[PDB]
Amino acid sequence: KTLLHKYSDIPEGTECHRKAYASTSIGGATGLIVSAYSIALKPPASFLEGVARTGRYTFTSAAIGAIFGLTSCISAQVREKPDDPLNYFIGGCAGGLTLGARTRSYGIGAAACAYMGLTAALVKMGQLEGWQVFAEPKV
Amino acid sequence: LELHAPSYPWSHRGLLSSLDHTSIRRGFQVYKQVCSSCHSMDYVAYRHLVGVCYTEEEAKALAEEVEVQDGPNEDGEMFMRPGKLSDYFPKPYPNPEAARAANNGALPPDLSYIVRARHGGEDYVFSLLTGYCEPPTGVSLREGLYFNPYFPGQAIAMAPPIYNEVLEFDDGTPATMSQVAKDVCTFLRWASEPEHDHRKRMGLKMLMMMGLLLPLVYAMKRHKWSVLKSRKLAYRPP
């Protein structure tokens, strides 16, 4: 949760380098978890193969996070509109393009751009409007 | 700490825009009736305003208004002459030290190149003229110094030089402080860059000529290089 607090604490549209670093850390953590699950469920033939798979997944996730944070913060700075979800959408589409590049497929890139950008815009909207993915029971 | 001047939408900001010579004429009125007393324009002469904002007859009449010292006569003594279009704008003070003495130890800068000299150009002058304000809390001004936020240091020897109805324009335009500052800034821009409109015209002509020539010269280069570009090389060993 400390990484999420790190990403949130940096003001939007400011300290773009720190925001990119936080996004990269989050992407790396997610990639590490995915790599652990992949190694367990689908066993790697060798320790070197497991390390290669972990590195590939982690680098892809970290690149996605870094591109998302860098592009979103830079767009927020240049447009100068901090709370606009379009910045998050641009960052998400850039992340999807990065995923397509890492997977060396155009179709993956385009589908990821659309879906990931929309999800990031929705996340920004949830920040602005106070949407709760997990709601404390209040009845 | 300094306050950068806002970028006002001057008419001449356009890439191919020209100074409004009506504003230049009113700015010359403003200079000759307000600024000339302290500031000077050594590098501008009445002849320079003969096809810009005043006619030749008007320019000569303006020159004849101001007396000018003339080369010594047969007796060997200098004398005062009515003034001629060749003569440059009269200098307000005989020497810089006298100007400093008149203005509390500060030398009123020459306004011939002021717009180019100062960062911000006409925007800086406009803001400084219209930017006088009461000294901020915690800031104490020395005797003879007026707080102007835009001026570096925020302390200026010049007193608020433009006020409503400082002068009456010949055109009849209302003599508001903003209008006077705008006209004077336009005139100063003309002074610093008397070739502004001609530069713009030459720029338009050069842009069109380049738009014509570059595609044609590129076409010539392509015509010559097509032989190499389409070349097909085949290695046929024995």
């Binding site: - | 809390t137 915690g138 409503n164 402080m177 903003s178």
Partner: protein, 68 residues
């Protein structure tokens, strides 16, 4: 009459703007702080700089339209 300069009207309009209003409030707070202290060396020049930056940025867009 008094030939109300368009600068007065435009700066009054700009003062009725969120950035100008908040800058003015900060300026007022620093004014109270500096006035209270007997021998403080602080000044309100920076807060005035913020307020005037916002106000005159608005005035840049508005003023010249009036001046003909």
């Amino acid at each position: 009459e008094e030939l109300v300069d368009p600068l007065t009207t435009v700066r009054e309009q700009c003062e009725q703007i969120e950035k100008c209003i908040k800058a003015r409030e900060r300026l007022e707070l620093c004014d109270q702080r500096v006035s209270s202290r007997s021998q403080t060396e602080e000044d309100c020049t920076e807060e005035l700089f913020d307020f005037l930056h916002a106000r005159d940025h608005c005035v840049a867009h508005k003023l010249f339209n009036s001046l003909k």
